[PDB]
Amino acid sequence: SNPPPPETSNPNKPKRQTNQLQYLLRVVLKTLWKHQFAWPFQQPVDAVKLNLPDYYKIIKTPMDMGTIKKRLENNYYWNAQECIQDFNTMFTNCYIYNKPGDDIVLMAEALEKLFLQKINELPTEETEIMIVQA
Ligand SMILES: O=C(NCc1cccnc1)c1cc(-c2csc3c(=O)cc(N4CCNCC4)oc23)cc2c1OCCO2
């Protein structure tokens, strides 16, 4: 079976918004979301229908841009780097599970290159906008 998707809320985790996290949603995530190769990563992986053996034993932290989107919309992240690591995990999950040079790997690599380019547009100084304590 497929496990439930990753959490996008946590009662013990404070909610936070920064100017960096805003840019990640409005520009970085949006740019990747409109990319030609976004569609395999817009939702959690369906290992059953895709015939991916032992995907959730090897991939212990599944991640997708739909989860990242919901986490940004509901201020799940502590800061921008926690969001960046979800992008990073999404890419490396595909890299460690598939043969280098495979189609899905080429798609992930193209998204990561665009991701690195858009991340360079991030405001260097962090501006906290709001914190909602848990
Ligand atoms: O390829 C996909 N659809 C093929 C297809 C069939 C019919 C019609 N249209 C397209 C595919 C792959 C991932 C996806 C995200 S990560 C990841 C990974 O690590 C390894 C693999 N695979 C699957 C292919 N064999 C190699 C290993 O797929 C993924 C997610 C998806 C996909 O389509 C549906 C939406 O959600």
Author numbering: 43 to 176
What sentences appear in the manuscript?
BRD4 contains two bromodomains, BRD4BD1 and BRD4BD2, that recognize acetylated lysine residues in histones and non-histone proteins. Of the four members of the BET family proteins, BRD4 is the most thoroughly characterized, and its aberrant activity has been associated with NUT midline carcinoma, colon, breast and prostate cancers, neuroblastoma, and hematopoietic cancers. BRD4 overexpression has been shown to promote tumor growth by stimulating transcription of major oncogenic drivers, such as MYC. In this study, we report the biological activities and mechanisms of action of thienopyranone (TP)-based inhibitors with increased potency toward BRD4 and selectivity toward BRD4BD1.
Further modification of SRX3212 into SRX3212P yielded the most selective inhibitor capable of distinguishing BRD4BD1 over BRD4BD2 by two orders of magnitude. In all complexes, the thienopyranone moiety inserts deeply in the binding pocket laying parallel to the α-helices of BRD4BD1, whereas the benzodioxane moiety of SRX3212, SRX3212P and SF2523P is oriented toward the ZA loop of BRD4BD1. The carbonyl oxygen in the thienopyranone moiety of all compounds forms a hydrogen bond with the amide nitrogen of Asn140 and a water-mediated hydrogen bond with the hydroxyl group of Tyr97 of BRD4BD1. Although the hydrogen bond between the side chain amide of Gln85 and the dioxane moiety of the thienopyranone scaffold is conserved, restraining SRX3212, SRX3212P and SF2523P, the presence of the pyrid-3-ylmethylaminocarbonyl benzodioxane moiety in SRX3212 and SRX3212P altered the hydrophobic contacts with Trp81. The indole ring of Trp81 flips over ~ 180° in SRX3212 and SRX3212P compared to this ring’s position in SF2523P, enhancing its interaction with the benzodioxane moiety. Unlike the morpholine oxygen, the nitrogen atom in the piperazine group of SRX3212P cannot serve as a hydrogen bond acceptor, and the lack of this contact with His437 may play a role in reducing the binding selectivity of this compound to BRD4BD2. The ability of piperazine-containing compounds SRX3212P and SF2523P to associate and inhibit PI3Kα was also decreased as measured by kinase screening assays. Because SRX3212P is a potent inhibitor of BRD4BD1 but not BRD4BD2 or PI3K, whereas SRX3212 is a potent inhibitor of both BDs and PI3K, we measured and compared cytotoxic activity of these inhibitors in three cyclinD1 dependent mantle cell lymphoma cell lines (Jeko-1, Mino and Z138), a colon carcinoma cell line (HCT116), a MYCN amplified p53 mutated neuroblastoma cell line (SKNBE2) and a PTEN mutated prostate cancer cell line (PC3).
